[PDB]
Amino acid sequence: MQYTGSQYFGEYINGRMEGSAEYILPTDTRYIGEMKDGMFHGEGTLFFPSGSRFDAIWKKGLVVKGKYTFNDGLQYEDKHWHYCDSYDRRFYTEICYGLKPSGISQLTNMDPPRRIPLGYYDCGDGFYNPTTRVIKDYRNRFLRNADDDEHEWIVRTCRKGWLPM
Amino acid sequence: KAEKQVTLALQRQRNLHEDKLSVIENHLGDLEGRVLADMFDFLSKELVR
């Protein structure tokens, strides 16, 4: 446990763990899991530091699974993903509700309505300006910086905090 | 006839003592093994996880 930070709540045999259990990993990831021989030997779900869920089934202490779901509960495909795309460009809440229940300007990814404050952009996590090559976090502190390739991607693809025309 | 029992005694004293001491020493090797082993296996398995 201590030497990496791992945590477990369950049963012990010979001093090594054999359990149906909830669990924490020094990612500060949470997990629910079954164990054998002091190893995971279970079908179990991994709850992110960001809450979202990965799933892990264990064969002889190795993983063989596919499922993901976001922390909002959006169900996801790692392949072909049919979402907000050619069949319909609607977000998770906009597909579930349709028109968001009262049509608040959150017919868009984040609102109530405002300009992006600093300048910069929206790319969901962070504000970034192509005139500064800096990303920022929604507390207006900072995020990873980016040269030409990512700068050019942001410049074309997403929404600047231009002045609201 | 004297030297025969001298050798027999010296031999059996040695051999019995050796057996006894090795027997005792074994248990300690057991417990040292146990304590080493449980950590070694836990933390290695942990890493690969």
Side-chain angles (χ1 to χ4, degrees):
Chain A
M1 290 192 180
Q2 291 84 348
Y3 344 109
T4 63
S6 58
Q7 317 193 13
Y8 161 78
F9 315 108
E11 276 195 322
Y12 301 80
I13 316 185
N14 297 84
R16 72 175 185 260
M17 296 175 289
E18 340 279 312
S20 298
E22 187 166 38
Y23 201 110
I24 324 180
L25 302 94
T27 312
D28 295 352
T29 301
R30 249 174 58 256
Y31 167 65
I32 286 167
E34 308 84 57
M35 300 200 86
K36 185 187 177 185
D37 204 54
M39 311 197 295
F40 303 121
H41 197 170
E43 176 165 28
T45 290
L46 286 83
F47 313 97
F48 286 21
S50 62
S52 87
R53 64 172 292 172
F54 167 72
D55 293 358
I57 308 153
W58 296 87
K59 171 195 172 186
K60 266 272 62 180
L62 295 94
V63 176
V64 278
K65 173 63 181 201
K67 181 166 181 174
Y68 176 68
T69 281
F70 284 97
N71 195 40
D72 59 358
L74 175 61
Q75 303 178 20
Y76 180 72
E77 310 166 273
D78 70 324
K79 297 181 185 181
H80 315 79
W81 193 36
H82 307 299
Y83 177 83
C84 194
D85 57 12
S86 60
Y87 303 145
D88 201 356
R89 287 172 47 208
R90 279 188 293 144
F91 305 139
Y92 172 48
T93 54
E94 303 174 332
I95 61 180
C96 292
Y97 299 123
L99 200 169
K100 200 163 188 282
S102 190
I104 193 164
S105 63
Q106 205 176 17
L107 307 184
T108 63
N109 204 265
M110 186 196 298
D111 265 349
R114 285 194 174 183
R115 193 193 177 200
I116 291 147
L118 197 56
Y120 287 60
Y121 255 79
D122 268 319
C123 69
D125 59 342
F127 314 116
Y128 170 93
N129 212 322
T131 67
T132 72
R133 294 160 169 269
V134 168
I135 313 170
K136 277 212 175 196
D137 63 327
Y138 244 78
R139 288 193 180 216
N140 197 4
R141 310 174 290 183
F142 207 88
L143 282 184
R144 71 194 173 260
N145 318 86
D147 99 284
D148 305 9
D149 167 54
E150 178 151 29
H151 161 89
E152 184 156 72
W153 171 79
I154 297 174
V155 160
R156 195 261 82 64
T157 62
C158 302
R159 190 168 68 171
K160 199 185 178 179
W162 31 52
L163 282 165
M165 303 302 294
Chain B
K1 186 171 183 177
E3 296 166 335
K4 161 187 180 174
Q5 194 55 22
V6 174
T7 176
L8 267 292
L10 283 173
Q11 280 287 308
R12 289 173 178 225
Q13 159 265 318
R14 174 86 298 238
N15 299 351
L16 191 75
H17 172 91
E18 280 180 3
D19 296 350
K20 200 67 55 175
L21 176 56
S22 67
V23 159
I24 297 304
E25 289 172 334
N26 296 340
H27 311 138
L28 320 183
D30 325 351
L31 299 170
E32 298 155 12
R34 201 212 183 292
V35 298
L36 174 165
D38 222 351
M39 171 47 132
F40 240 105
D41 304 344
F42 154 70
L43 86 178
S44 57
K45 283 172 169 186
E46 186 82 321
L47 182 54
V48 180
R49 303 297 95 71

